[PDB]
Write a protein that binds this ligand. Structure first.
Ligand SMILES: CCCCC/C=C/C/C=C/C/C=C\C/C=C\CCCC(=O)O[C@H](COC(=O)CCCCCCCCCCCCCCCCC)COP(=O)(O)O[C@@H]1[C@H](O)[C@H](O)[C@@H](OP(=O)(O)O)[C@H](OP(=O)(O)O)[C@H]1O
Ligand SMILES: CCCCCCCCCCCCCCCCCC(=O)OC[C@H](COP(=O)(O)OCCN)OC(=O)CCCCCCCCCCCCCCCCC
Ligand SMILES: CCCCCCCCCCCCCCCCCC(=O)OC[C@H](COP(=O)(O)OCCN)OC(=O)CCCCCCCCCCCCCCCCC
Ligand SMILES: CC(C)CCC[C@@H](C)[C@H]1CC[C@H]2[C@@H]3CC=C4C[C@@H](OC(=O)CCC(=O)O)CC[C@]4(C)[C@H]3CC[C@]12C
Ligand SMILES: CC(C)CCC[C@@H](C)[C@H]1CC[C@H]2[C@@H]3CC=C4C[C@@H](OC(=O)CCC(=O)O)CC[C@]4(C)[C@H]3CC[C@]12C
Ligand SMILES: CC(C)CCC[C@@H](C)[C@H]1CC[C@H]2[C@@H]3CC=C4C[C@@H](OC(=O)CCC(=O)O)CC[C@]4(C)[C@H]3CC[C@]12C
Ligand SMILES: CC(C)CCC[C@@H](C)[C@H]1CC[C@H]2[C@@H]3CC=C4C[C@@H](O)CC[C@]4(C)[C@H]3CC[C@]12C
Ligand SMILES: CC(C)CCC[C@@H](C)[C@H]1CC[C@H]2[C@@H]3CC=C4C[C@@H](O)CC[C@]4(C)[C@H]3CC[C@]12C
Ligand SMILES: CC(C)CCC[C@@H](C)[C@H]1CC[C@H]2[C@@H]3CC=C4C[C@@H](O)CC[C@]4(C)[C@H]3CC[C@]12C
Ligand SMILES: CC(C)CCC[C@@H](C)[C@H]1CC[C@H]2[C@@H]3CC=C4C[C@@H](O)CC[C@]4(C)[C@H]3CC[C@]12C
Ligand SMILES: *[C@@H]1O[C@H](CO)[C@@H](O)[C@H](O)[C@H]1NC(C)=O
Ligand SMILES: [Ca+2]
Length: 1326
């Protein structure tokens, strides 16, 4: 039994890894066919299973006979291996048919190589240790969903079951939209009536019939996938007046707030983890290695200089004459002239390669073909001459030179491979555009951008491990999907492409679900495959998981990578700059030392050059927090007429009137009718615009007599020109429209007038300027990808209307469309796909749409189906091209976009301080003392009579079992709140109503008991008691309304039910970690309202612009501009803008209004719509994303002190416990309290602060004795003013004990730091 010492060798471990990889390949080679069909390879691979099972069992047996049982089973990975082998053995000996739950375990086999490689185990532990603090967020998220689900269950229960059945002939609805009989809901057209019962919108899956369906629908909504479809279904089922008030708060809270919480928690976790001893040591090693290299390079340059100096004096007096040539070459390959020449050559090559487009002239094609050879030869001659003038070892030292060599080799391979078989092309020749990255060399941003690449290369193994772990999880989920839905997607209609039949299809489906686009469609297909709504509805959980741990795990990989690398680069750059400054000042100070024969002026020179550059120390919040965390960790480790037109603008009440006129003009702009130009409202608006432009020009003309003013000049001049052209016929009506839409800039004038709005706009602009270099790099990478995509896909995105024809000449005439069983004659026409890659601009637009994530499966399908230059598509022709898109998703949406967030997180500047010299010592200590400054020991108001009646009620109410009963009563009432379902029996609804009755009665009894035991003016003091009373009163009003027959049409009262649905909030107070986080983030939100004002102004401006431009588009169904989504009104425009901001079909909306749309039969122009929608939508998406990210980072950095807590010396929270303890023992302040209570209070005090063990109590005595005593005054005196202050002073930054006599200086420091407190603490210092 000595297997461990003779059978646990490296080579045996690599034989077990080969068994696993082979098993993975066998699993990936399986194919699933419907209805029991099987390929011969299926049986051939099935015959391979028992050898794998035998090998696994042998390895398990060796490990058992080496380690024992319950220490071999003590490892979780060994437990997983044992479970896998046991399930395999049972399957081998299993003849019964209930093996599906056992054969689905063999998808965990790829996870076994995680156990075989401990490095992957360490990486997985590191990635999963940052997800525990996210769990509470998920809990909160679940609560939110539950709450919203309940609200849905109370409003949209069985509302989607009505449809326009024509005449009850065969019960086939004509339209897939809900009804309302008369009412403001949507009506049937033609000979149809809305009969009862029709499954629902999506096969009857998305509805609010019961709590489970409501929960699933709300979860689908929060992921912002198809929530607008549900919104429109509610709109046309019950009217559009109040449905937005349910979905807009739902989307906001469930997506934006959750994402902000996740980002903040992750940022705090990363900041805490970066300052650990291991990471700090690794960073110090990297910094030392980088610092050595600069000195080495300087010394080698010095050495080369001497080698070329001792070679000219050695020849001045064959194999030597060829070496001055090498020296001259090396002096030539390093000069600025050669650098600029090669940079211009690379720029010209980029220009030449960027002109490729579909249907280019043959002369241009030949010119580019020859220029490729010319450029390849030139680049080859610049890589050989620079390699001989520097040497192979010195040339390969720089990483970008290695990249250049790789690109040259790939280009040569492409050139030789493009002649022996000219088909498509890889596109490596475009990669030379990355050589433009030399531009940053001549700027001052070279060090910062180079340090990021240095840090990226330093931790390459970690990046590879993380990517491989992600790929392994994707493979495991693909195998699970293959087992669950493999071969079950063969429906009566066309089989969906997004299926789980083969391994490539399953892995593409899993990747698409990970991105989060159209995952609900795949979920619907899976549910339909598993039986439908009736049975098989439990197959959704898979997708649920694949969403959750698929949408918050990438944010834990790529965001972590970005934060770590960018923080490392920033710290490296800052340390390099400060070390250079220190070395320069030391050298200049030493300069004066050698010159002792005269008074030196070097000291003055270094003095005048030491403060001018000092004003560049930004010291962002992230850097300050990192420094404080480093200090704390190190301490813990160690311790173990001109005047008549200028006085009018000087008036105090002149800016306010201008602001109110600006607001009035903005409101008048909002309330405009685009579709009906000729209306009395439009005439009144024109008359008001006359007054507005008159007052604007009047105030403007008196301002020039004494950038933003430039904008005011354009506004005024455009208004004047429009008025001048108004008094004539329609001369150049397009110019009139342009000058009319120019008036939207009126709200922009408010930015300067409000100092706070101007400040926040300046902060946003500064944040934008902070990421300009990364934006340029991102644009260069996107351009390279777009050029490659143009090269790959130009011309191939053409298709005929019917798939039978493959050529343009064949796609002529008419064909038979066999849709909806009508076989209609439809014209054949050779069309082009909406999003293509004809030229670089179209490719850039398509890649932007892909990066946003909308409709990228469609472009993936089109790219895969593309065949040739002028030939129609063929399904699955080139599947490998999907790699391209995968790579794109790895680089832009995932990587590049996550380094934008990090670059804003780590460089965010504090705004509420605006100065770094306030106290230089307190960041949380100041807040900790201010908490005691403001929070007085508020009491619980114990009754003072206690004679016969009030004391009994008070004792009953404040009793712990009463609170427990209320909690159980509030938790059991929520169980009866979600237990309602559609088409329930009458007795069931009666029981539900009776239970609601008794619960409301119990809560009313509790409220009246509290009123009696506390008092009218005491119960209402609490903000929670008044909320409870409001909910009780609302429930009573609802129950009274319900008992009496409801007013059918007099007053529509159905909102009061929400009050009862509010009881959930009543149970939100039990959690001691969700309340303190929710309240903290809400209080940070309420402290930054001007960011929200800026976002609202952005939405207002874009809504007005859309109203003016695309307002009169004709409403048509089966499009993106219809009765649900249009630009007609201000509310409709805002809804469209919000839908695009979340992102549903913004590309489809853009295409639905481009310069050729059929125009409404009520407006003036017969052809309305413009090609301006491209810029409109792209700019709106970019700006909305940027401002939302800025708001998120502002909120996160407002709370960074709490998000990086490291809770062991916490002070902001222990004061709450102190107040809670003091309140119970104190009925009222009464000035002063006794002494003996404080000892039992310290005993009952939280052990985290004050006493850990029995021994530290002595230290507490050392804090009570051996210093100044408050016993000088009356012993009947409070001590909280002197106890908590002393404990918070001595817990951190203790100074009195080492001195023992310098108390007066500490008191003076405290006084000068509390200078303006209105002398309130002077009486508390004693
Ligand atoms: C992680 C998820 C997925 C990530 C997807 C994208 C991940 C990467 C995405 C973004 C990373 C890049 C961010 C910004 C890029 C560049 C910033 C500015 C340029 C920069 O970073 O500096 C380069 C980076 O080179 C590259 O490899 C160029 C970088 C090209 C990288 C493309 C390949 C990426 C695929 C990896 C393949 C393996 C590599 C490294 O800097 P360096 O080492 O060359 O610096 C030297 C140094 O300054 C020397 O003093 C100087 O010599 P002297 O003339 O004697 O002073 C050298 O001059 P030469 O340039 O003539 O040699 C410089 O080049
Ligand atoms: C940590 C998680 C915290 C979660 C907090 C959640 C906060 C947001 C909650 C949003 C709830 C308000 C929106 C209600 C959705 C309205 C749905 C609807 O269609 O209502 C119409 C309804 C009658 O339907 P109607 O079509 O008019 O008639 C035919 C069919 N009966 O009724 C009507 O006739 C109109 C009445 C509905 C519109 C007004 C309702 C009051 C809204 C006040 C503002 C929000 C109050 C928030 C209260 C929080 C606690 C619930
Ligand atoms: C500065 C502007 C705001 C800036 C926002 C900043 C971003 C925050 C998030 C975006 C908010 C977008 C809100 C969009 C709400 C859309 C509401 C809607 O569509 O409701 C429809 C209905 C009126 O729709 P409409 O077509 O105008 O009228 C039809 C009958 N004539 O609606 C009604 O009947 C409305 C009932 C009264 C609502 C008053 C508000
Ligand atoms: C990286 C730097 C050096 C590139 C600078 C920009 C140009 C190289 C790009 C930007 C605009 C691109 C143009 C974008 C739009 C067009 C129009 C296009 O012309 C046609 O499509 C005519 C055929 C037809 O539609 O019938 C030819 C490509 C061209 C000029 C592109 C050629 C390459 C251009 C000129
Ligand atoms: C300062 C910002 C928030 C813009 C103003 C807020 C808007 C949401 C409010 C303020 C004025 C409201 C407008 C107040 C007056 C009207 C006119 C109203 O139409 C009619 O009065 C019917 C008369 C006719 O049929 O001609 C339509 C709503 C509308 C523009 C309202 C739409 C919503 C508006 C634009
Ligand atoms: C963090 C990353 C690594 C996640 C994705 C891992 C990729 C390597 C996966 C996801 C997409 C997979 C691709 C999904 C689709 C295809 C096409 C397909 O190629 C075929 O020729 C299929 C053959 C057939 O038609 O039956 C299989 C390889 C490839 C690119 C797969 C290879 C492995 C890929 C590239
Ligand atoms: C001073 C501004 C900012 C506030 C007042 C502007 C809005 C509320 C005013 C300006 C002109 C007004 C319109 C003038 C004419 C008509 C025609 C008729 O159908 C009655 C209502 C209606 C449609 C008015 C509704 C209210 C209206 C749109
Ligand atoms: C790291 C950054 C700069 C990405 C640069 C590499 C990109 C452009 C490379 C990496 C892998 C490459 C793909 C690899 C394989 C194929 C299959 C071939 O039949 C067509 C080209 C295609 C689809 C390539 C296109 C270009 C591609 C996506
Ligand atoms: C906390 C959980 C476990 C118990 C409280 C949840 C109760 C109220 C929920 C959980 C699952 C729900 C059931 C889920 C499915 C159905 C089938 C439907 O055709 C009638 C309603 C019915 C029977 C639901 C009634 C309410 C229900 C029982
Ligand atoms: C002025 C600001 C928005 C700078 C952005 C300018 C560019 C991106 C925008 C501003 C106005 C736009 C124009 C507005 C209207 C039309 C008419 C249409 O039939 C063809 C396109 C064309 C000519 C647009 C092209 C793009 C355009 C020039
Ligand atoms: C069937 O249609 C006719 C007219 O097409 C109309 O009377 C009604 O909708 C139906 N007739 C019935 C229900 O008798
Ligand atoms: Ca979407």
């Amino acid at each position: 039994k000595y297997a461990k010492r003779i059978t646990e060798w490296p080579p045996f471990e690599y034989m077990i890894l080969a068994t696993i990889i082979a098993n993975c390949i066998v699993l990936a080679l399986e194919q699933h066919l419907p209805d029991g069909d099987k390929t011969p390879m299926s049986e051939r691979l099935d015959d391979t299973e028992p050898y794998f099972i035998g090998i696994f069992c042998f390895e398990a047996g060796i490990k058992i006979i080496a380690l024992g049982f319950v220490s071999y089973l003590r490892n979780g990975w060994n437990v997983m291996d044992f479970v896998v082998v046991l399930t395999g053995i049972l399957a081998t000996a299993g003849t019964d048919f209930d093996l599906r739950t056992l054969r689905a375990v063999r998808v965990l086999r790829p996870l076994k190589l995680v156990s075989g490689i401990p490095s992957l185990q360490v990486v997985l532990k590191s990635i999963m240790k940052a997800m525990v603090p996210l769990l509470q967020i998920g809990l909160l998220l679940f609560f939110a969903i539950l709450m919203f689900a309940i609200i849905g269950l109370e409003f949209y229960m069985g509302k989607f079951h009505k449809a326009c059945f024509p005449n009850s002939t065969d019960a086939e609805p004509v339209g897939d939209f809900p009804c309302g009989k008369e009412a403001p809901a949507r009506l049937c057209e033609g000979d149809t009536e809305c009969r009862e019962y029709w499954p629902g919108p999506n096969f009857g899956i998305t509805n609010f019939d019961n709590i489970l369906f409501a929960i699933l629908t709300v979860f689908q909504c929060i992921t912002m996938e198809g929530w607008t479809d549900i919104l429109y279904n509610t709109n046309d089922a019950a009217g559009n007046t109040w449905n937005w008030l349910y979905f807009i708060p739902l989307i906001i809270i469930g997506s934006f707030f959750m994402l902000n919480l996740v980002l903040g928690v992750l940022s705090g976790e990363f900041a805490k983890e970066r300052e650990r001893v291991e990471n700090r040591r690794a960073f110090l090693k990297l910094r030392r290695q980088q610092q050595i290299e600069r000195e080495l390079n300087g010394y080698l340059e010095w050495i080369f200089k001497a080698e070329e100096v001792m070679l000219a004096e050695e020849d001045r007096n064959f194999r030597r004459k060829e070496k001055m040539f090498r020296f001259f070459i090396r002096r030539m390959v390093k000069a600025q002239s050669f650098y600029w020449v090669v940079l211009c050559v690379v720029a010209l090559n980029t220009l030449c390669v960027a002109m490729v487009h579909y249907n280019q002239p043959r002369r241009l094609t030949t010119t580019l073909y020859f220029a490729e050879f010319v450029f390849l030869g030139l680049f080859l001659t610049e890589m050989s001459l620079k390699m001989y003038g520097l040497g192979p070892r010195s040339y390969f030292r720089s990483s970008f030179n290695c990249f250049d060599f790789g690109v040259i080799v790939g280009s040569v391979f492409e050139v030789v491979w493009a002649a022996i078989k000219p088909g498509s092309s890889f596109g490596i020749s475009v990669l030379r555009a990355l050589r433009l990255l030399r531009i940053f060399k001549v700027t001052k941003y070279w060090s910062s951008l180079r340090n990021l690449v240095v840090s990226l290369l330093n931790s390459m193994k970690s990046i590879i491990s993380l990517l491989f772990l992600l790929f392994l999880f994707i493979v495991v989920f693909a195998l699970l999907g293959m087992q669950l839905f493999g071969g079950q997607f063969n429906f009566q209609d066309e089989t969906p492409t997004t299926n789980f039949d083969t391994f490539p299809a399953a892995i593409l489906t899993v990747f698409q679900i990970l991105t989060g686009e159209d995952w609900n469609a795949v979920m619907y297909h899976g549910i339909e495959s598993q039986g439908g709504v009736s049975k098989g509805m439990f197959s959704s959980f898979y997708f649920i998981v694949l969403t959750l741990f698929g949408n918050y795990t990438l944010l834990n990989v790529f965001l972590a990578i970005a934060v770590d690398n960018l923080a490392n680069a920033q710290e490296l750059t800052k340390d390099e700059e400060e070390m250079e400054e220190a070395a320069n000042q030391k050298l200049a100070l030493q300069k004066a030392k050698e010159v002792a024969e005269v008074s030196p002026m070097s000291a003055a020179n270094i003095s005048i050059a030491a403060r001018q550059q000092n004003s560049a120390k930004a010291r962002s919040v992230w850097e300050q927090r990192a420094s404080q965390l480093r200090l704390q960790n190190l301490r813990a480790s160690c311790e173990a007429l001109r005047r008549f037109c200028h006085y009018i603008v000087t008036m105090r009440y002149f800016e306010v009137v201008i602001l109110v006129v600006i607001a009035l003009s903005s409101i008048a702009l909002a309330a405009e009718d685009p579709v009906r130009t000729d209306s009395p409202r439009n005439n009144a608006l024109k008359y008001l615009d006359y007054i507005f432009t008159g007052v604007f020009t009047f105030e403007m003309v008196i301002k020039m007599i004494d950038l933003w003013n430039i904008l005011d000049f354009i506004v005024v001049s455009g208004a004047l020109v429009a008025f001048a052209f108004s008094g004539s016929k329609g001369k150049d009506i397009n110019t009139i429209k342009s000058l009319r839409v120019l008036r939207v800039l009126r709200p922009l004038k408010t930015i300067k007038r409000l100092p706070k709005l101007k400040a926040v706009f300046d902060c946003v602009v500064n944040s934008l300027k902070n990421v300009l270099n990364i934006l340029i790099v991102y644009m260069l990478f996107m351009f390279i990808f777009a050029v490659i995509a143009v090269q790959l896909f130009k011309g191939k995105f053409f298709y005929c209307t019917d798939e039978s024809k493959e050529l343009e000449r064949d796609c002529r005439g008419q064909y038979l469309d066999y849709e909806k069983e009508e076989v209609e004659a439809q014209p054949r026409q050779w069309k082009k796909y909406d999003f293509h890659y004809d030229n670089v601009l179209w490719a850039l637009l398509t890649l932007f749409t892909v990066s946003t994530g909308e409709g990228w499966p469609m472009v993936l399908k089109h790219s895969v189906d593309a065949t040739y230059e002028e030939q129609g598509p063929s399904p699955g022709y080139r599947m490998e091209l999907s790699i391209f898109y995968v790579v794109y998703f790895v680089v832009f949406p995932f990587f590049f976009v996550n380094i934008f967030v990090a670059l804003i997180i780590i460089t965010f500047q504090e705004q509420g301080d605006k100065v770094m010299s306030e106290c230089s010592l307190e960041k949380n200590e100041r807040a900790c003392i201010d908490f005691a400054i403001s929070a007085k020991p508020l009491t619980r108001y114990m009754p003072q009579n206690r004679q016969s009646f009030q004391y009994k009620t008070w004792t009953f109410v404040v009793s712990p079992p009463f609170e427990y009963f209320i909690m159980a009563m509030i938790a059991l009432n929520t169980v009866v709140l979600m237990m309602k379902f559609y088409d329930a029996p009458y007795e069931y609804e009666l029981m539900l109503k009776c239970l609601n009755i008794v619960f409301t009665s119990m809560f009313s009894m509790e409220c009246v008991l509290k009123i009696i035991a506390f008092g009218v003016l005491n119960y209402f003091r609490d903000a929670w008691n008044v909320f409870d009373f409001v909910t009780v009163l609302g429930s009573i009003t609802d129950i009274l309304v319900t008992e009496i027959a409801e007013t059918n049409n007099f007053i529509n009262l159905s909102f009061l039910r929400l009050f009862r649905a509010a009881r959930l909030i009543k149970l939100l107070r039990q959690g001691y970690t969700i309340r303190i986080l929710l309240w903290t983030f809400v209080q940070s939100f309420k402290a930054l309202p001007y960011v929200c004002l800026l976002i609202a102004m952005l939405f207002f401006i874009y809504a007005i612009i859309g109203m003016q431009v695309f307002g009169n588009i004709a409403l048509d169904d089966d499009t993106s501009i219809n009765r649900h989504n249009n630009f007609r009104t201000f509310l409709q425009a805002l809804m469209l803008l919000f839908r695009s901001a979340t992102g549903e079909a913004w590309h489809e909306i853009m295409l639905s209004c481009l310069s050729n749309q059929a125009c409404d039969e009520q407006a003036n122009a017969t052809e309305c719509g413009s090609d301006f929608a491209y810029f409109y939508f792209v700019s709106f998406i970019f700006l909305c994303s940027f401002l939302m990210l800025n708001l998120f980072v502002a909120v996160i950095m407002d709370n960074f002190e709490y998000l990086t807590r490291d809770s062991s010396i916490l002070g902001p929270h222990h004061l709450d416990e102190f107040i809670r303890v003091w309140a119970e023992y104190d009925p009222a302040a009464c000035g002063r309290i006794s002494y003996n209570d404080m000892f039992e209070m310290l005993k009952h005090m939280s052990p985290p602060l004050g006493l850990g063990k029995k021994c530290p109590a002595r230290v507490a005595y050392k804090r009570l004795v051996r210093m100044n005593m408050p016993i000088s005054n009356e012993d009947m005196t409070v001590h909280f003013t002197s106890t908590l202050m002393a404990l918070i002073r001595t817990a951190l930054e203790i100074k009195l004990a080492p001195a023992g006599t310098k108390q007066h200086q500490c008191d003076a420091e405290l006084r000068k730091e509390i200078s303006v407190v209105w002398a309130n603490l002077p009486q508390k210092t004693l």
